Amino acid sequence: LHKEPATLIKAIDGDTVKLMYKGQPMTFRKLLVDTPEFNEKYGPEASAFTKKMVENAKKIEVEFDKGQRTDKYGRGLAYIYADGKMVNEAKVRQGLAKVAYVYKGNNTHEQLLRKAEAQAKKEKLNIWS
Ligand SMILES: Cc1cn([C@H]2C[C@H](OP(=O)(O)O)[C@@H](COP(=O)(O)O)O2)c(=O)[nH]c1=O
Ligand SMILES: [Ca+2]
Numbered sequence: 342l343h344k345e346p347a348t349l350i351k352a353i354d355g356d357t358v359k360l361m362y363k364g365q366p367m368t369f370r371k372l373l374v375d376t377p378e379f380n381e382k383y384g385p386e387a388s389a390f391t392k393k394m395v396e397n398a399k400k401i402e403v404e405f406d407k408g409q410r411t412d413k414y415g416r417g418l419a420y421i422y423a424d425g426k427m428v429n430e431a432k433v434r435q436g437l438a439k440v441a442y443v444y445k446g447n448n449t450h451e452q453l454l455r456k457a458e459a460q461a462k463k464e465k466l467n468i469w470s
Pocket of ligand 2: 375376465
C-alpha cells in the first residue's frame with residue numbers, strides 16, 4: 342500500500358470527505374470505520390474531530406487498499422492521512438468512531454484499527470464510556 346497526494350476540497354462529515362485526487366474532485370468514504378451521525382450521541386464531536394484534523398492538515402494523503410477503489414455510490418474507498426497521521430485510526434483511537442464495514446478485499450489496516458479501538462474501550466473513551 343502506498344500513500345498518494347490529494348488536497349482538501351471540503352470536510353463533509355465523520356466518514357466522508359471531498360478531496361482533489363489526480364486533479365479531479367472526489368467524495369471519499371473512509372475505509373474500516375463508522376461514525377455516529379450528528380444527531381446521535383457523540384455525533385457533533387465526532388464530525389468536528391474529523392473536520393479539524395483534515396482542515397488543519399498541511400498535507401493530506403490517500404492510500405487505497407488492494408480491493409475495490411470505489412464503492413457502489415461512486416465514493417473513493419481509502420485510508421486518509423493528515424500530516425502523516427491516519428485519520429481513520431485517529432477517530433477510532435478517540436472513541437469517536439467504531440471499526441466497521443470490514444470487507445475481505447480492503448482490510449489491510451484491520452488489526453491496526455482494532456487495537457486503537459481496544460485502547461479507547463480500555464480507557465472507556467466517549468462512545469465506550
Ligand atoms: C465503508 C464502506 C461502505 N460501503 C457501503 C456499505 C453501506 O451500504 P448501504 O448504503 O447499503 O448501507 C454504505 C455505508 O456507508 P455510510 O456509513 O457512509 O452510509 O456504504 C461499501 O460498500 N464499502 C465500504 O468499504
Ligand atoms: Ca456512516
